[PDB]
Design a protein around this ligand. Structure first.
Ligand SMILES: Nc1ncnc2c1ncn2[C@H]1CC[C@@H](COP(=O)(O)OP(=O)(O)OP(=O)(O)O)O1
Ligand SMILES: [Co+2]
Ligand SMILES: [Co+2]
Ligand code: NA
Length: 357
């Protein structure tokens, strides 16, 4: 069949048949992303993404006939796989000192690219010789991502995620039995493990007052017990759906790190530190906007991008993290479910576990 160039019309399941290429592409892509080069990183992700779609491994350079997002540059990258087994380019970058370190520092919760670059140039090459250095002071968000570096870098599975879900509920519920918490992000896509536990919190009966207070009280609540390890409650700023470099307007969200006493987890498995620091996101959205919060905060990163990218370029509409807009009939189209939204963008629904680009 003749597929599409818009991930929004792609069925990207976690069942990948080209992990080989895809991986090697993700390296070069993560490369261009760090070597401050916002360009090629686009033809990489977009290519590596398409492949994740195919229902069969690519064998001969013959199969790549038809498939889009595949320019003469990337093929020579697949080339080095078919007739070799690994990508000389990729295989190269992994041992490239700029990369290694960068992906080594940013790996810290709190370490950005601007911060991970001033260090590289200072000469540091390991984070063992950084925290130690008695000179440069660390932002709280960094001291944090540092103090718990271990458990954090250790990823999380479902059983862990779930321990957090109740955790959140038994809490948020104590401030709104009306509350509706949906486990969102990667985990809701079907990843059996992710970096963090993304959540979306909402409720029908709730004033525009009770909203801007819950993300704090709940925070304070765990704080009251010890479970809170770090917090950064960004006040809801967002409310014309943006389309360029805007993370400037968002729902009320918060980045955290909880203390998940292992006793409170349900895994078929039998260590010091009965608990584990775990990264969690939290978002609140007035009930009349759950429909987009979910879609927006559900990913995939690349999926979202291509979604609204389609929205604009193909339907003359604007898809916000909050609300869509029809530039032709100049009206705010809305919906009570993701399902409806696609129907609006004129798209055959893509189940959440199908948005794994
Ligand atoms: N500034 C932003 N503006 C809009 N959406 C954002 C912004 N930051 C994050 N998001 C949304 C889009 C993707 C979703 C992403 O998160 P994350 O990167 O935590 O998801 P993941 O779930 O894919 O990775 P992991 O398994 O590590 O959580 O949250
Ligand atoms: Co996440
Ligand atoms: Co997140
Ligand atoms: Na980071």
């Amino acid at each position: 069949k003749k597929i599409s160039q818009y991930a929004c019309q792609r069925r990207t399941t976690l069942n990948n048949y080209n992990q080989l290429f895809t991986d090697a592409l993700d390296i070069l892509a993560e490369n261009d992303e760090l070597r401050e080069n916002e360009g090629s990183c686009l033809a990489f992700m977009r290519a590596s993404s398409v492949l994740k779609s195919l229902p069969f491994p690519i064998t001969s350079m013959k199969d790549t006939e038809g498939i889009p997002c595949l320019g003469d540059k990337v093929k020579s990258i697949i080339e080095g796989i078919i007739e070799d087994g690994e990508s000389s380019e990729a295989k190269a970058v992994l041992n490239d000192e700029r990369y290694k370190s960068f992906k080594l520092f940013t790996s810290v919760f709190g370490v950005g690219l601007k911060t991970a670059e001033k260090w590289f140039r200072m000469g540091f090459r390991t984070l063992s010789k950084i925290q130690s250095d008695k000179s440069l002071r660390f932002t709280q968000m960094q001291k944090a991502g540092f103090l718990y570096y271990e458990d954090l870098v250790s990823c999380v599975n479902r059983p862990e995620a779930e321990a957090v879900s109740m955790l959140v509920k038994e809490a948020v519920v104590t401030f709104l039995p009306d509350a509706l918490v949906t486990m969102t992000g990667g985990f809701r896509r079907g990843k059996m493990t992710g970096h963090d536990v993304d959540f979306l919190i909402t409720s029908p009966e709730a004033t525009e007052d009770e909203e801007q207070q819950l993300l704090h009280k709940v925070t304070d609540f765990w704080k009251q017990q010890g479970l809170l390890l770090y917090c950064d409650i960004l006040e809801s700023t967002f409310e014309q759906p943006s389309r360029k470099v805007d993370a400037l307007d968002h729902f009320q969200k918060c980045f955290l790190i909880l203390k998940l006493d292992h006793g409170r987890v349900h895994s078929e498995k039998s260590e010091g530190k009965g608990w584990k620091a775990i990264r969690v996101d939290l978002v609140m959205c007035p009930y009349d906007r759950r429909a987009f919060a979910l879609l927006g905060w559900t990913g995939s990163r690349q999926f979202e991008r291509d979604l609204r990218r389609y929205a604009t370029h193909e339907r003359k509409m604007m898809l916000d993290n909050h609300a869509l807009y029809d530039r032709t009939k100049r009206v705010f189209l809305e919906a009570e479910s993701e399902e409806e939204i696609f129907a609006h963008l004129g798209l055959d629904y893509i189940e959440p576990w199908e948005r794994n680009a």
